[model samples]
Target: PRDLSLTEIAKHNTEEDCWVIIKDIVYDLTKFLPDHPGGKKAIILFAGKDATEEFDMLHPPNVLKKYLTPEVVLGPVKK
Candidate 1:
């Protein structure tokens, strides 16, 4: 994938536009939020930020692949 800055990621902070980072990779959860099995609250809480801690605890590595194609995987975090 390509690089995606936190600045760009943060722009998607609202419920209508949300992105989250897990293990340095960004995933746009905007479309998935309402249907999120963990609930929209979790996505709202972590939107536009790194959610590695919570996600690692709650999901398997393959979880993203199941729900998202590479299109949703925005890219890497900037330093």
Candidate 2:
């Protein structure tokens, strides 16, 4: 995995190309949007932004491992 800058991640901030940061790691969630249990709106709200705070607030530590596949993980943030 390569390091991606926030600037690069920000460019993907859209429903068709969404990316988000969780625990400093980046994930391309575009394909998972419609499948989100909470709905795409919730995920879209944090598109291309760090969602760690909101994610941790509503989910367990192992939520990602259980719900998402490894392919969704793009890499870590540059910073």
Candidate 3:
């Protein structure tokens, strides 16, 4: 990742919204609004925080190691 500042993501990319996508998988936390199961306001709060660390903690992919990182999140690649 090129280090996308939290404000750039949550404010601009995420459009100040609660949820976004990852590899065609829709992570709809909009229903959670600000309070998520991870923690109160975790979804909305962590948006501008270092999510890369937490991402590695939770969904650590097996086969595709690089794909697991938030740095490679956005979408799929063309081989």
Candidate 4:
């Protein structure tokens, strides 16, 4: 996996092509959007941008690792 610039990540903001940045790491969440525990709107609100703050507010530590498989991780964000 490789890091993607914010500009590049922004292009993926959509229900059909969703992505999220959490703690600077990118996640390909397109498939998970439909089945998100918090619902689509919750996750979609941070689409294409860093969701670290919101994510931390709503989830426990290591929650992503617990729910999202390693394959869903797309790597970190570009500098």
Candidate 5:
């Protein structure tokens, strides 16, 4: 998959920026922009980085990140 620049990636961010992912790995905090239980703005703070480690660190027991479906937001794969 192609990596979108933080700028190219920003548009996908919804006001509700609940959460999205890349390559079934990187979690995008775009959707978490609205009323996120963790303080909406807080999630968005990790916008363009590979947040896997941080996500795990931030939510160790909750498994909140596991609920995210990487394919839905990223769309179907070519292969």
Candidate 6:
């Protein structure tokens, strides 16, 4: 996976192309949006932004490993 800059990630903020930063790693959640248990709005609210804190508040650290596939992970944010 290639590292992505915040500027590149931010360009995908819309629902049709949502991406979010979690623990400094970028994830393309566009396809996963409709299946989000909390509702698409919850994830969309954090689109193109760092959502580590919010995600941790509601889920365990292993939630991603259990629920999302590896392909969704777009790699870490560019340092």
**Which numbered prediction scores highest in lDDT against the true structure?**
6
> What order do you get sorting by lDDT, best first?
6, 2, 4, 1, 5, 3
Worst 10 residues of 2 by lDDT: 1-10
Candidate 3 lDDT over residue span 51-70, tens digit each: 44555566655623432344
Model 2, range 1-79, lDDT digits (tens) per residue? Answer: 4349988888889999999999999999999999998999899899989999999999988889998888999888996
Task: Give the whole-model CA lDDT for all candidates, comma-separated.
Answer: 0.85, 0.91, 0.41, 0.87, 0.48, 0.91
Off by over 4 Å in 2: 1-3
lDDT of 4 by residue, 11-76 (tens): 889888889999989999999988788898788888898899989998999788778888789898
Clashing pairs in 2: none
Model 6: per-residue Cα lDDT over 1-79, one tens digit each: 4349988888889899999999999999999999998999999999899999999999978889988998899899997
Q: lDDT: which is higher, 2 or 4?
A: 2
Pairs that clash in candidate 3: none
Off by over 4 Å in 5: 1-28, 65-79
Q: Any runs in candidate 3 off by more than 4 Å, and if so which? A: 1-7, 10-16, 19-36, 59-79
Question: All candidates: CA RMSD in angstroms?
Answer: 2.7, 2.1, 8.6, 2.0, 5.3, 2.1
Cα miss at 49, model 2 (Å)? 0.3
Candidate 1: worst-modelled 10 consecutive residues by lDDT:
1-10
Tell me which of candidates 1 and 4 scores higher on TM-score: 4
Clashes of 6: 0
The local lDDT score (0 to 100) that residue 48 gets in candidate 3 is 31
Model 6 misplaced stretches (Cα beyond 4 Å): 1-3
Clashes of each: 0, 0, 0, 0, 7, 0
- State residue 35's C-alpha deviation in candidate 1, in Å: 2.1
Itemize residue pairs with steric clashes in candidate 5.
16-31, 17-30, 17-31, 17-32, 18-31, 18-32, 19-31
